[PDB]
Amino acid sequence: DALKVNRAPVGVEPQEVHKWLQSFNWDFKENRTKYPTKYHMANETKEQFKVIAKEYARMEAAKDERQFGTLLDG
Amino acid sequence: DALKVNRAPVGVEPQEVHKWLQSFNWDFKENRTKYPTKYHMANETKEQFKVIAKEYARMEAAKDERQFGTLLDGLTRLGAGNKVHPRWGETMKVISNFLEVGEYNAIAASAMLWDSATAAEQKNGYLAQVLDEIRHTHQCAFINHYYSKHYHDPAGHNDARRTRAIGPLWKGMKRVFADGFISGDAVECSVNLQLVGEACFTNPLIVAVTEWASANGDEITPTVFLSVETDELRHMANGYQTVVSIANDPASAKFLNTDLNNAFWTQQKYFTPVLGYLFEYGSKFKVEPWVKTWNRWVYEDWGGIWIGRLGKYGVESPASLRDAKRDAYWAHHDLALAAYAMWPLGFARLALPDEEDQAWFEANYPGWADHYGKIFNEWKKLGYEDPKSGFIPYQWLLANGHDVYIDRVSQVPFIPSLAKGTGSLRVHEFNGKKHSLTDDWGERQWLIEPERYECHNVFEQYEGRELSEVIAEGHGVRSDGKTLIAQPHTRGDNLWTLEDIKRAGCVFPDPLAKF
Amino acid sequence: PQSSQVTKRGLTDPERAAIIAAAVPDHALDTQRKYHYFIQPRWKRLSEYEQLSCYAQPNPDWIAGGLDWGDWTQKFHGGRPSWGNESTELRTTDWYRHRDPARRWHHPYVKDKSEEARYTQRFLAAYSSEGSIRTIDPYWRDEILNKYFGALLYSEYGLFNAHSSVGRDCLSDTIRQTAVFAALDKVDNAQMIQMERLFIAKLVPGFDASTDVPKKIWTTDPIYSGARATVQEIWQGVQDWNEILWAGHAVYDATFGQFARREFFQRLATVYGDTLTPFFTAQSQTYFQTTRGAIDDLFVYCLANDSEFGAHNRTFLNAWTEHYLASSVAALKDFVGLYAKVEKVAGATDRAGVSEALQRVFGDWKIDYADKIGFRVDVDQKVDAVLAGYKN
Amino acid sequence: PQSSQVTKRGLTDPERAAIIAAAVPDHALDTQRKYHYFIQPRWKRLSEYEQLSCYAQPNPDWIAGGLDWGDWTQKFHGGRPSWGNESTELRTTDWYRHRDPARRWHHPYVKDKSEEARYTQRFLAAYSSEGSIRTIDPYWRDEILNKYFGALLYSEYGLFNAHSSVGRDCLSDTIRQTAVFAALDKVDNAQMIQMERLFIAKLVPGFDASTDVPKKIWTTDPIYSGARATVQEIWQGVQDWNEILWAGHAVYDATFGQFARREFFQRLATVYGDTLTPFFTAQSQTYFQTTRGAIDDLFVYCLANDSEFGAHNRTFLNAWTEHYLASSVAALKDFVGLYAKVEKVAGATDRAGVSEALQRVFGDWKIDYADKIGFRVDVDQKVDAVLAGYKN
Amino acid sequence: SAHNAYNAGIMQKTGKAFADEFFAEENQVVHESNAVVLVLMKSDEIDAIIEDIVLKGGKAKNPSIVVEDKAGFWWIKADGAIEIDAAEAGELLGKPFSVYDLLINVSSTVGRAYTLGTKFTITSELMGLDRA
Amino acid sequence: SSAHNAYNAGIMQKTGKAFADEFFAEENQVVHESNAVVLVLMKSDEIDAIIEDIVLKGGKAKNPSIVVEDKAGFWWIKADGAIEIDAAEAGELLGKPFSVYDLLINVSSTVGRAYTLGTKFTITSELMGLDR
Amino acid sequence: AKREPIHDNSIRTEWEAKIAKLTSVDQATKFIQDFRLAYTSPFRKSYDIDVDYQYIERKIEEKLSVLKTEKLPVADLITKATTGEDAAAVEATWIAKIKAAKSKYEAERIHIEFRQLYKPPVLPVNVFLRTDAALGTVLMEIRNTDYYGTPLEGLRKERGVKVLHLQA
Numbered sequence A: 001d002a003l004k005v006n007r008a009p010v011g012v013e014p015q016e017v018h019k020w021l022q023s024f025n026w027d028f029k030e031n032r033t034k035y036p037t038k039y040h041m042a043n044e045t046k047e048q049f050k051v052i053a054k055e056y057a058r059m060e061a062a063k064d065e066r067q068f069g070t071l072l073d074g
Numbered sequence B: 001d002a003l004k005v006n007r008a009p010v011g012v013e014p015q016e017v018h019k020w021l022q023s024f025n026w027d028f029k030e031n032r033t034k035y036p037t038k039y040h041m042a043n044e045t046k047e048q049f050k051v052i053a054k055e056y057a058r059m060e061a062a063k064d065e066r067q068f069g070t071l072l073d074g075l076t077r078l079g080a081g082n083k084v085h086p087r088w089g090e091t092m093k094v095i096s097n098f099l100e101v102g103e104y105n106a107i108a109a110s111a112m113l114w115d116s117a118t119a120a121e122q123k124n125g126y127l128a129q130v131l132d133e134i135r136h137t138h139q140c141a142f143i144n145h146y147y148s149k150h151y152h153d154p155a156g157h158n159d160a161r162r163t164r165a166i167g168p169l170w171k172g173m174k175r176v177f178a179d180g181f182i183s184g185d186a187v188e189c190s191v192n193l194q195l196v197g198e199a200c201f202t203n204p205l206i207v208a209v210t211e212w213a214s215a216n217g218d219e220i221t222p223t224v225f226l227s228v229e230t231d232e233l234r235h236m237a238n239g240y241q242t243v244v245s246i247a248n249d250p251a252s253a254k255f256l257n258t259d260l261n262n263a264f265w266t267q268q269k270y271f272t273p274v275l276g277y278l279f280e281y282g283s284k285f286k287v288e289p290w291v292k293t294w295n296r297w298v299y300e301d302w303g304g305i306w307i308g309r310l311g312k313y314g315v316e317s318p319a320s321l322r323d324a325k326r327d328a329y330w331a332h333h334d335l336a337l338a339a340y341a342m343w344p345l346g347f348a349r350l351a352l353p354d355e356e357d358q359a360w361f362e363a364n365y366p367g368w369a370d371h372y373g374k375i376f377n378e379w380k381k382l383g384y385e386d387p388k389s390g391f392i393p394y395q396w397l398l399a400n401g402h403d404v405y406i407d408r409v410s411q412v413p414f415i416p417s418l419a420k421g422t423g424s425l426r427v428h429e430f431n432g433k434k435h436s437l438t439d440d441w442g443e444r445q446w447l448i449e450p451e452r453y454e455c456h457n458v459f460e461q462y463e464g465r466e467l468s469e470v471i472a473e474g475h476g477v478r479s480d481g482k483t484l485i486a487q488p489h490t491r492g493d494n495l496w497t498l499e500d501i502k503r504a505g506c507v508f509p510d511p512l513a514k515f
Numbered sequence C, D: 001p002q003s004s005q006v007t008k009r010g011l012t013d014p015e016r017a018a019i020i021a022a023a024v025p026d027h028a029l030d031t032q033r034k035y036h037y038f039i040q041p042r043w044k045r046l047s048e049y050e051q052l053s054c055y056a057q058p059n060p061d062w063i064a065g066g067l068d069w070g071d072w073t074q075k076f077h078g079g080r081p082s083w084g085n086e087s088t089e090l091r092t093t094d095w096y097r098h099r100d101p102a103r104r105w106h107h108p109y110v111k112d113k114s115e116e117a118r119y120t121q122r123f124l125a126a127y128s129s130e131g132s133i134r135t136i137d138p139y140w141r142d143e144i145l146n147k148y149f150g151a152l153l154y155s156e157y158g159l160f161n162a163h164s165s166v167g168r169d170c171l172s173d174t175i176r177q178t179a180v181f182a183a184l185d186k187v188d189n190a191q192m193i194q195m196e197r198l199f200i201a202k203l204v205p206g207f208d209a210s211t212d213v214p215k216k217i218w219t220t221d222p223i224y225s226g227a228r229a230t231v232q233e234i235w236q237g238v239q240d241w242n243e244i245l246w247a248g249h250a251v252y253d254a255t256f257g258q259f260a261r262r263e264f265f266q267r268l269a270t271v272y273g274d275t276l277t278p279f280f281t282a283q284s285q286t287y288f289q290t291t292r293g294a295i296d297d298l299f300v301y302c303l304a305n306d307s308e309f310g311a312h313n314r315t316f317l318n319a320w321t322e323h324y325l326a327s328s329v330a331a332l333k334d335f336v337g338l339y340a341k342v343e344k345v346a347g348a349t350d351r352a353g354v355s356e357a358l359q360r361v362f363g364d365w366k367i368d369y370a371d372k373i374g375f376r377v378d379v380d381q382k383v384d385a386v387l388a389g390y391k392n
Numbered sequence E: 001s002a003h004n005a006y007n008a009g010i011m012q013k014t015g016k017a018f019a020d021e022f023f024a025e026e027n028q029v030v031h032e033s034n035a036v037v038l039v040l041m042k043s044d045e046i047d048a049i050i051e052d053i054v055l056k057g058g059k060a061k062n063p064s065i066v067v068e069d070k071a072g073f074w075w076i077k078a079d080g081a082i083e084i085d086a087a088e089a090g091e092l093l094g095k096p097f098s099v100y101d102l103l104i105n106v107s108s109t110v111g112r113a114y115t116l117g118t119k120f121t122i123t124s125e126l127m128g129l130d131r132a
Numbered sequence F: 001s002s003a004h005n006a007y008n009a010g011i012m013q014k015t016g017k018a019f020a021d022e023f024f025a026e027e028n029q030v031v032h033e034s035n036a037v038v039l040v041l042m043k044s045d046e047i048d049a050i051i052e053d054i055v056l057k058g059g060k061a062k063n064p065s066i067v068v069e070d071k072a073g074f075w076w077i078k079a080d081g082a083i084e085i086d087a088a089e090a091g092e093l094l095g096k097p098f099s100v101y102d103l104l105i106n107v108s109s110t111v112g113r114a115y116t117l118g119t120k121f122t123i124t125s126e127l128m129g130l131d132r
Numbered sequence G: 001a002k003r004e005p006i007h008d009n010s011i012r013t014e015w016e017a018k019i020a021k022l023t024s025v026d027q028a029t030k031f032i033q034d035f036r037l038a039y040t041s042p043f044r045k046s047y048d049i050d051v052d053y054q055y056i057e058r059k060i061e062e063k064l065s066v067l068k069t070e071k072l073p074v075a076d077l078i079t080k081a082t083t084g085e086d087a088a089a090v091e092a093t094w095i096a097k098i099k100a101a102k103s104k105y106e107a108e109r110i111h112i113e114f115r116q117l118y119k120p121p122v123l124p125v126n127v128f129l130r131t132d133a134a135l136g137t138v139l140m141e142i143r144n145t146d147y148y149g150t151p152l153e154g155l156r157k158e159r160g161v162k163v164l165h166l167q168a
């Protein structure tokens, strides 16, 4: 209601968003690749490194800062 | 209206917000500083480096990312942390941790300038300075933190915040850039902390030292210290704005020359011998004579670009400068005698000057060989470095009448029978207590302000106690509980233990009992 | 060439590197590589935040928790120590106990605010390009937001300057860091309010971003009469640094400050079509909860429950709370007169809406602060006291 | 020890460093130190963005602007070249001309999004601690926001995958960077929509953050019928990579996308007491304006005004615009049926409010895109076309 | 201008010759100097600024500029003032470079320093005391 | 220990004609199945702590076949079966926030099947989706 | 003389035993005032506990402060000294006292004795800090008047030191 709520500090981890990515696709007749291929087998798999856009950027920027610090400074 | 608007991309630059900062203050009767001060002149000034909170963080975070990239990535991959000459790796135990307490006290001093400021822009600039001094505290900690992880002797790098309390050189550090800043007139901090401390002494202490580090293989300290000083531009600029307002009011200007002279002497009394000792004796490769470093940075550039230029507006050359120049030439050599003689009380491993060092000392300080050099070579022959010798030079000094005294004001050690720097012993009894003073400037400070200077010295606290027991009680040992952190040599073998110290039978006397 | 020698680097110069390598021993001289290993860790492992911060303050043993000994080298005229027990009424067995739960030393602090600084400017350049300001209620924009949200910056500015004496007087390193970071966040709030006003001025012709009207309202409008009196007292009326931190953050800003920022300007922005203000209140409210965690640790974990002085400290904390809560209730009673100038929205600006907003603020404050120091408070009584200033 | 040699570093090993010092000449062998100095700078001086990006694609001279020569080393079965002019109808004198006005190479791109990533999580932990969700209109939260803003993630997701063939087929380095960065921002939008729904689920018991209802609405509800038909065609119905970029960003997302994100969910959040959604739409709208700057440069500066093929390209751009604008107004006509389910607020959700919102979207689009390629459009005609789907 | 060199004047002497001048009566008070000292910590951006701005257009305007290599930083001394335009450096570096970014590696100043627009300046002038 | 996982194990010990004779031997003209995994960690402050206090202690205690070699700029690790690194253990070691995503900042190369499960990173010889 | 350990010795233990027997605010106030007059400042009566008096003073402060919160009404903690005097009257009395001092030697003793008598917990912290700062302002100003006017030989006589040694 307007008065009572859980005020425990929470966020949303990347894996929490990632578990719903598989449901972002929907079925329609043209939903298939545009390029020629010999391989037409079922290939609905899960990726081993759960990543979303925000977490991708955080990881790579962290790598960059250490790399460019070493180059441009040290 | 609901349809038409200028859709050009615009933001708000920091100077756009900053121009309205001065209007953030409002008038009420209690809107004044809480701290005692002699200065009550108009001081509504503008800060030369417009900065707001968001831009402050952006600037400093950008400095940090490059600094920590160099340390945690590049230099670690090179193994640079153990590529430092042992003398300089030991020196950075003292330099970085002692500076750390100066940075930490600068937070509190900058808060007094913040509190005593009357213009909103000035209060804004001093908060940024307060934040910078926090940054510098953690930067100094990070140097010793990094040394603890990668350097061949982490002991003393890893616990100075308690092991520094054992030795006498730490007492003077708590005044030079600490108590001397925060325990006095709040707006006078623009003179002692800023016009003197930041504008004069940070340059040799933080900038010039980085070339000595590089010469001796240390690239960690230049990475950090050079980033530290980038903040000092704003700090110097903040203080100058207040010094101008002081010089412009005749009632305020009549306090400036005395405060300047007291500040210069207070800081140089410790800075000059201690830093000169750490530069020349705590290194293998010398960049230049310390007295030339002092001449370049303190006397010629600071004294000429700041004090000499301000002479056009009533600021006088410090009356104590003559005494200070004598200290610049000899006082660090005097201090080396006390530092080497009382080595078990520190937290660093020391190295007697080798034959190449001795030739360098005598060439650049003629007379050094026949005085200091002969003493160090006699100590070596007596077994200064050998843990089985039972020899510690402090007892040797006493047996030959070379008593060590502690200045009640500056805490700087003084050996009158061996000193070539400025000083003469004055021993006064007052209210049933004996006090030793060492120069004309400190004695005036104590005579006029005795209740400001009641610092206990190591001889008063340790009187009658044996050396090894003081060290053990103060945790001055390595993780084995027995081997000393401090050593009289920089080699990996034959390290001294508490039992080695105990065999010498060194007991602290009362140096004033004979008066 | 140059007049001074080009110093050869010991790291790369072959001759000096060989000399250094011969002098460095082939083994470590100790195995203890944890920087300040003797710090008592608050959490399961010692943190870098603690390693870099703790015992940086060189307190002697006669200041609770200090590891040094003896008197200070130089004191104030008269004898005031550099730091001393006379600086606050509160007592503890160890002033070093405090821990910021966010574990902020300087670098993570400026790192986070730098993200906010740069993203803010990217947001403003896109917002101006979007033209989204076109749908804001002009009366709210011109007569309520510009004037009274602008006036609110002076509350944030006064709370910022209240920390000046705290930054000098407080007795430990972690406390000093908490206070200074909290001070910057307050002056940031005041600068961000002005930034939004300057931003709107670039989008709306005739919109005056000068602080003349906001300052006149803060200093003379009875709507801010109680708030300004309270801020002047917390800032310039006391020097007990624990009283300043408690009265400032745990009482005044937690009650009046939270109502003004969150219940009035942020909430009503989302009923008057204001798509801009929530971006700025998002920052001040994030800063408030971060500051609260550190303020909560100092006064509740450390002081109100100190093994020897907990009840002693609660005696002073109770007395301070009673005084500054009355100030804050009087400030809110003055402030809710601003609802007489706003467009009526059912459930938000009517009596029932304002009542529920006061129930949230006073109710949250009882849970977050009052219950933790044993301060009894009747929430409905405090709500009804403020509502006495609400114009039906 | 170890089986392989511990390699001595030439930078620090004295013996190897001395050998290197003897081999390095005592002077530079050329004075041109500007990396790829021959790139034609778009601005006053060469930028690092251009230095690192331009001519990375190894095009031959028979692809306009290429500096190489000869055929590709390996082509598709049948003869399709690695890259070829057959990939798009549009022509230019130089495919390398495009410049992102934000000058984003990979590092500034992830640097900025990293700031948004970390600040978002700090905002959510503070927002949940603030309890500000308590004042949101529950009907908007449960029946409009959760269901139809959730359904909108499938629009952003489809636009993201429309770039897959673009990332392979497009003919220059700066274009490829623009296309890929735009694709990540779209999938970010869809992931951020789901993040808000999962976040609300932690605050409101009974709130279902599953995508079951949003997906059912996206795939079967007539409110999104036109939008989904358009996204399916732009994503999977065409392979001309310029057509995809233009139809996707310059027509569909610039009309339907901007109305849904900015005029509906972001705007109405600030009339129904939603203090949470504006934080998320702030990012998607920032990403849109950033993408628009690069898309504007590709199609207006470079293609619609190419010295030899400007009018030629406008012929195709006009035909694409006519087709995909008709698709977008049909999408908008379906979408404005959602106003029949919202609580009526005068000037926002009534006929006049929706009309003024459509006038902003279509009016801004005429200035930002249509006027620049010579596409004639009657704004009032398109507004009245959409308003035919609005229930009075 | 060799009078601005790090090892100028007394710094050339060693041994007794140095001590004789160091302790000379006329050198027991400070001497007013019209110079400024600027320290720049070495980095990619700073080394480019030193070579193509300070040692070119900088020294062309102020021929008294002396630049010395001090391992980890640049040592600069000149008569009157030293200026660095961040806008000029930004054109040189090819990346965003405000006056705030310039200060990232500006380590030390001996003199009166300020920022005016995109320009950083350290000057011998005593602002607020000297005539405007 | 296990010398068969060393960088210079087997044929790599030989030089000259001896190396060529085995390199061109008939049985060495087809690949041979290996149960090993190879993990590469680029050197850094965080990684060097993880190598010394995790991989060379509890790591090799669980998997005695682990071989670690110094390759100047990176660590070379080879072991039978699998290699695992728990980011939670590293975070306790470093005293700062350290998720499994932060652990991957300096994990350079993998020869084998790699994945993250919770806070643990693992590279295994198992062919997931095919084995068992 | 042989000093005992720094942080744990018989002097501190013996004084902690004396402090534990204080049972009233009045008794503890007399205890702490007598202690500060006897063992603190350059005008103390005795240096016999010099390396221990600061820690012992801390323990006396802690005892008096807890006794205050246990026995005194809230208003007394804010507006009264534990001597019973009105805190504001104490401030006005001692500010007027130091402003009437005819020399720095008179002014220094007024400031020193004020701290000896009214250092917290005797005076409320807020009142004490106000007065201490006001007193320090006057003391600093009169001391920094002709700071170098009196030669050291005259300063030694004005201070009243017994000169034990002057190096040639």
Ligand SMILES: [Fe+3]
Binding pocket: B103, B106, B132, B133, B136
């Ligand atoms: Fe500093």
Ligand SMILES: [Fe+3]
Binding pocket: B106, B133, B198, B232, B235
């Ligand atoms: Fe500073």
Ligand code: NA
Binding pocket: A032, A033, A037, A039, A040
């Ligand atoms: Na297929």
